[PDB]
């Protein structure tokens, strides 16, 4: 941070995989892309300084 | 809506309107004709010389009565309302008329309208209390010295604008009737141009009860019955709310008091409201309504106190302080957890449970007094963890109810 | 005021009144006629022989709809609300209906009424959890063994009064409609006459979620489409407050919970209110309200703990002990003054300033701490007084900065 706002994170699962150029024949990867339900959990965030602020 | 808040609801000085004060009230007097029924004669001037009529007074005669309501009633300048005293009286005698208000007010105009000639010597009193103490304001006489032991047409010293002057000006007759009284305290005062910052004058206007005594009067001819008479009384003012109430209303026990806004208390808005003990009470000014402000407990008390040095040493900012500073909170703002507890950081600064205890592991933690800064409980030996419950790297838990975790070689 | 407290406010067992529980709520089911719009034929017995009528079911036809509201709406004995299932289904298949609760209860009445014939094989379930685990309650079938592996009309053994019996009772037709099933969980149970002291029954009544599955229904013909149908349901109960709340109200997050009185907490009064831990939580009895009880801190602490051995060795009297004893206090009740301070014996036993510093005479006293009980500083030979400053009778002050007081020869 920056970005303090409007941060842009564009995860591309396709990045870095050596055999991604032939994904049409990557069944384990064709399973890695299989997804029905999604969950997102956080615990940690940065600090600064150092209820003045109500961090949220 | 409320003149105490502007178009954008900004708290602004709201004031009772300027109205005549002595309109319709009643007065206890020194004496009055008609008990027993009294007489009085009336002379009139014709062109250059005189012609004399004569009349009588029965108080038991309604139209020949002259009640004090005639001074306070709506006086028609064509159907006058003249009160009269008994006759055969003159200086030296206290010719005093009474008035009790019951609420503090601010006054600007004082006018009179006579059914008798204008005398020479008279004085003023007032009461900044409820009819107990009395102080004068100005004097009027030809012999300010022989009568009042005063100089005529004194000067208004800047260092004491509370001077009480006396003069013979406009003590003349004519008018023999229909006397014209127009007195402005602010005339002659060099510091009258901004009344909002003239407290001595704002004290010069301070008055609760009023007393007026009369003295010397003209004899012309020179058989005679001398008296005094007056058709009405008008005095304008606004109800004293220190700029903290736009008006004044009666109490549950019939008492006209300010609807004290600006966090103010007292029938005149003289003090702050209860718990409004963050900084002392002040009066609304044109720039700022110098409002009162409550103490903070962040929702943790109903009573509070105050100290000025706090506001003084705050760089003139604040001095409020809790009373019974509750909800496991403490401080002038009930703004921190007392000994034993820490801050429930998840909650806001004013949450009822904004304070958190130390629920430290009665075995793995060494006490229930964790540092109020971090929720870190007193972990004993190489044991770590928030409540100090688990074992650490190289620490195996034991069922010993003393030392669970033990190093490994 | 509160039926939780007797004539003189004596704490007595208070329970939310006996009410139907499943009145008006929504129910998700396994299936229902009308998707796609379904038909259904209706037979009626006339004297001795048969007559077969027939109708259809679209849920999109409100009058031909049969929502689960038909199960929960009020049963007008003159406007019944018959829900119906889809057809062509029977054992072996789960015929399951759902229920979303949110407060734990104990139940007495469960009433039913049929729009369909009464089948033969059925069972009961329950869940003391929030929709995760599920356990049965009783069985009902003619073939208790081949279908349910059950004995028919077993006895309720005292050693397991939580028996789950099976019977063919009321699994018969007639009744072909409006069938009545009389089930009392208390039937057969030897310890039902004193339920307040029947914890297994106090557990046998414990239930949070409920499940019901069907397999077998009667066949009669011997084309037709066979179904399941019901007009309404009644189940009476009281909100589980352990005798510690006279009713149940919503939570701040819209959750109907007991207004747990008697210093109890939890949606069911299952736990005590915070800082009520001298003797454990118990259920109100007719003899004793078996309430919660706080620790004594003499107005000097807000946290406390407990040990069983404490109450155990107390002859069953008390075991509370306070934490973080402020006001320079300390002890199980914060009931003595710490090192450096002493006890203001004149001041009350729980007063905020019961402790005073050991202001020991830096010359006349030797230690820094005085009698934490009395306040006696180290009085030197002829010096007396609590902090030991003065000379005694026959002792003269000297300018010696070590021994000021000297006896007389
Ligand atoms: C103060 O100023 C007032 C107002 O001007 C004057 O008020 C007078 O009040 C008296 C009160 O009584 C009035 O008297 C009235 O006249 C009657 C005259 O008596 C004759 O009555 C009839 C003819 O009217 C004859 O048949 C009879 O034989 C008498 O010869 C009085 O007798 C009456 O007084 C009676 O009335 C009161 C109630 O009002 C009763 O309680 C008594 O019984 C009493 O006897 C009648 O009231 C008179 O009219 C008023 N004068 C006015 C209005 O001008 C006062 O006179 C004045 N005082 C002084 C000292 O100046
Ligand atoms: C489940 O059970 C219910 C109740 O028994 C049945 O409910 C029917 O619902 C339909 C709704 O589609 C009702 O149909 C009604 O009749 C019209 C007949 O066609 C004329 O349509 C217009 C006039 O409406 C004319 O201009 C045209 O030339 C035809 O002569 C239907 O067309 C209408 O439905 C119309 O409404 C929807 C919006 O609601 C529009 O988008 C369409 O244009 C649609 O055509 C009209 O509402 C019918 O009255 C109901 N029957 C009842 C109450 O007995 C269901 O039919 C049943 N389920 C199935 C699958 O049948
Ligand atoms: C004239 O002046 C005042 C009232 O204007 C009166 O002062 C009195 O002073 C004596 C002094 O002992 C007091 O006992 C009285 O109570 C005062 N009377 C008041 C305040 O009304 C003075 O008496 C007046 N002269 C009179 C009434 O003849
Ligand atoms: C019929 O029986 C039970 C409910 O009465 C269901 O139990 C299933 O059991 C299998 C066993 O491995 C699990 O994999 C399933 O997840 C269970 N189903 C659940 C939990 O819903 C069974 O599914 C039912 N069959 C139906 C309704 O068709
Ligand atoms: C003046 O007012 C009094 C009050 O009642 C009335 O009696 C009198 O008639 C009035 N005068 C005139 C001229 O109307
Ligand atoms: C409590 O935690 C703070 C936060 O880092 C730490 O600095 C301090 O040493 C700990 N102990 C105290 C305040 O007694
Ligand atoms: C029962 O209530 C429904 C509700 O719409 C109504 O249509 C029906 O006519 C009622 N039954 C009788 C017999 O009136
Ligand atoms: C406190 O004073 C009493 C008074 O007699 C004395 O007996 C005791 O030893 C003193 N010290 C204590 C209680 O620690």
Curated annotation (Swiss-Prot), chain A:
It is found in: Secreted; Cytoplasm. Netrins control guidance of CNS commissural axons and peripheral motor axons. Promotes neurite outgrowth from commissural axons but acts as a chemorepellent for trochlear motor axons. These effects are mediated by distinct receptors. This is Netrin-1. It comes from Gallus gallus (Chicken). The gene is NTN1. The chain holds residues 212 to 275 of 606 of the full protein.
């Amino acid at each position: 941070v920056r970005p303090l706002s409007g941060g842009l994170i564009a995860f591309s699962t396709l990045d870095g995989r050596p055999t991604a150029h032939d994904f049409d024949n990557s069944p384990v990867l064709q399973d890695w892309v299989t997804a029905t339900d999604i969950k997102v959990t956080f615990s940690r965030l940065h600090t600064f300084g150092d209820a003045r602020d109500s961090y949220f | 809506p409320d003149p105490c808040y502007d178009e954008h609801g900004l708290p602004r000085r709201c004031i009772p309107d300027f109205v005549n004060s002595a309109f319709g009230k009643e007065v206890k007097v020194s004496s009055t004709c008609g008990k027993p029924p009294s007489r009085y004669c009336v002379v009139t001037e014709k062109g250059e010389e005189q012609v004399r009529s004569c009349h009588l007074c029965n108080a038991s005669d309604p139209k020949r009565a002259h009640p004090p309501s005639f001074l306070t009633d709506l006086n028609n300048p064509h159907n006058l309302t003249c009160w009269q005293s008994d006759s055969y009286v003159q200086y030296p005698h206290n010719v005093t008329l009474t008035l009790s208000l019951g609420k503090k007010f601010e006054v600007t105009y004082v006018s009179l309208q006579f059914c008798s000639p204008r005398p020479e010597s008279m004085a003023i009193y007032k009461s900044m209390d409820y009819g107990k103490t009395w102080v004068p304001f100005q004097f009027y006489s030809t012999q300010c010295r022989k009568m009042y032991n005063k100089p005529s047409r004194a000067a208004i010293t800047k260092q004491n604008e509370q001077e009480a002057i006396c003069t013979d000006s406009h003590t003349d007759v004519r008018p023999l009737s229909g006397g014209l009284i127009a007195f402005s305290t602010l005339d002659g005062r060099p510091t009258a141009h901004d009344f909002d910052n003239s407290p001595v004058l704002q004290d010069w206007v301070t008055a609760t009860d009023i007393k007026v005594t009369f003295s010397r009067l003209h004899t012309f001819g020179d058989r005679d019955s001398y008296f005094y008479a007056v058709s009405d009384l008008q005095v304008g003012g606004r109800c004293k709310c220190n700029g903290h109430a736009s008006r004044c209303v009666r109490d549950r026990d019939d008492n006209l008091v300010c609807d004290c806004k600006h966090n103010t208390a007292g029938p005149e808005c003289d003090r702050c409201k209860p718990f409004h003990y963050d900084r002392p009470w002040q009066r609304a000014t044109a720039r700022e309504a110098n409002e009162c402000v409550a103490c903070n407990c962040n929702l943790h008390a109903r009573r509070c106190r105050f100290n000025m040095e706090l506001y003084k040493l705050s760089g003139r900012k604040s001095g409020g302080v809790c009373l019974n500073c509750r909800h496991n909170t403490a401080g002038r703002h009930c703004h921190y957890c007392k000994e034993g507890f820490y801050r429930d950081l998840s909650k806001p600064i004013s949450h009822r449970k904004a304070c958190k205890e130390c629920d430290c592991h009665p075995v793995g933690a060494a006490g229930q007094t964790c540092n109020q800064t971090t929720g870190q409980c007193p972990c004993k030996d190489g044991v770590t963890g928030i409540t100090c419950n688990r074992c650490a790297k190289g620490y195996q838990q034991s069922r010993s109810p003393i030392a669970p975790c033990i190093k490994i070689p």
